């Protein structure tokens, strides 16, 4: 009736402080489409985020990819913030520079 998503936070490329890149949040295995994903920068929600067109897996579970270019820094901390009508509250996954 209501499938809950699987959040993962990653980088389009091996992160290296001082170089252009892309920060991805991949959400899938969820249903209904009504989702709300935010990308954070040091706790603060980044303003301009892009997203892929809504396609649904082979098992009817919806998947999306949200992103934005970014320039990783050893000190700056990023994360994905997601909300579905199934979760009792927003979940937060922290990006790993080594995942």
């Amino acid at each position: 009736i209501q499938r809950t998503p699987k959040i993962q936070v990653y980088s389009r490329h091996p992160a290296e402080n001082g170089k252009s890149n892309f920060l991805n949040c991949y959400v899938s295995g969820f249903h209904p489409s009504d989702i709300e994903v935010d990308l954070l920068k040091n706790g603060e929600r980044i303003e301009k985020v892009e997203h892929s067109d809504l396609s649904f897996s082979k098992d009817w579970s919806f998947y999306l990819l949200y992103y934005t270019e970014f320039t990783p820094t050893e000190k700056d901390e990023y994360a994905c913030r997601v909300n579905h009508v199934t979760l009792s509250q927003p979940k937060i996954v922290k990006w790993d520079r080594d995942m």
Binding site: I1, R3, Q8, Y10, R12, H13, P14, F22, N24, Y26, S28, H31, P32, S33, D34, S52, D53, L54, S55, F56, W60, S61, F62, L65, Y67, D98, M99
Partner: protein, 248 residues
């Protein structure tokens, strides 16, 4: 080596506050070729292709617009049948397409619908092969697309792998093998130890964002016996299997 061309269909119901919507996507294998939304004026066609100069996506466009408008008259009466009170929101998702190939000779047409994420009966079978009916221009439109974007479509992008070490407090390290840049999404990443396959954590393959894919395999090894471990990478794009022993 056959190719595919499937159309996706998502329709969402808006209970008595406007109307439901939809949005279809076009995939020729592991590549998005088309996009189209509710009341949009024209579908979104991948730039890399030869871009319609007289390229008969006019065929596609007609079919999608008239076929996409079968949500408000396929959902609605589906929320009416089931009698789930047309007050909450429900979704139906349509999917068709084929898997052709001439020189191997053989077709295959697909078409199933799901209401609120549950398979509904369509009575037509499944392996029912094939050739005002998009089910007749499938192999055709498919053999056209491959000709418009033969650089991405007819293209096998090999993976670039590299391992990473994370020696932990406890005394155990975690070795992770990475696989980047590859197209298509089929790859077989494994971790072993003297020819033996460690019957190992990991991630579903995921989009990088430009067309390539990613993934990694992982194990927690006792820091001391980590030279006996290796990770294999096999993809259609590689000349010969990959055995990166921690990146040498």
């Amino acid at each position: 080596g056959s190719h595919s061309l499937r159309y996706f269909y998502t329709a969402v119901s808006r209970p008595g506050l406007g109307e439901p919507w939809f949005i279809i996507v076009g995939y020729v294998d592991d590549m998005q070729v088309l996009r189209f939304s509710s009341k949009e004026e024209t579908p979104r066609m991948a730039p890399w292709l030869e871009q319609e100069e007289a390229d008969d996506w006019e065929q596609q466009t007609h079919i999608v617009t008239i076929q996409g408008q079968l949500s408000e008259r396929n959902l609605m009466t589906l929320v009416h049948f089931y009698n789930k009170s047309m007050d909450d929101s429900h979704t139906l998702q349509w999917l068709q397409d084929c898997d052709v190939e001439p020189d191997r000779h053989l077709c295959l047409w697909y078409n199933q619908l799901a209401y609120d994420s549950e398979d509904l009966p369509t009575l037509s079978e499944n392996p029912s092969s094939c050739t005002q009916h998009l089910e007749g221009h499938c192999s055709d439109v498919l053999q056209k697309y491959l000709e418009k974007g033969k650089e991405r479509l007819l293209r096998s992008d090999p993976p670039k792998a590299h391992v990473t070490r994370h020696p932990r407090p406890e005394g155990d390290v975690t070795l992770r093998c990475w696989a980047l840049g590859f197209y298509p999404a089929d790859i077989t990443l494994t971790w072993q130890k003297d020819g033996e396959e460690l019957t190992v954590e990991f991630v579903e393959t995921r989009p990088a964002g430009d067309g390539t894919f990613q993934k990694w395999a992982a194990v927690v090894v006792p820091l001391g016996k980590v030279q006996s471990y290796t990770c294999h990478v096999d993809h259609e794009g590689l000349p010969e299997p990959l055995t990166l022993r921690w990146e040498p």
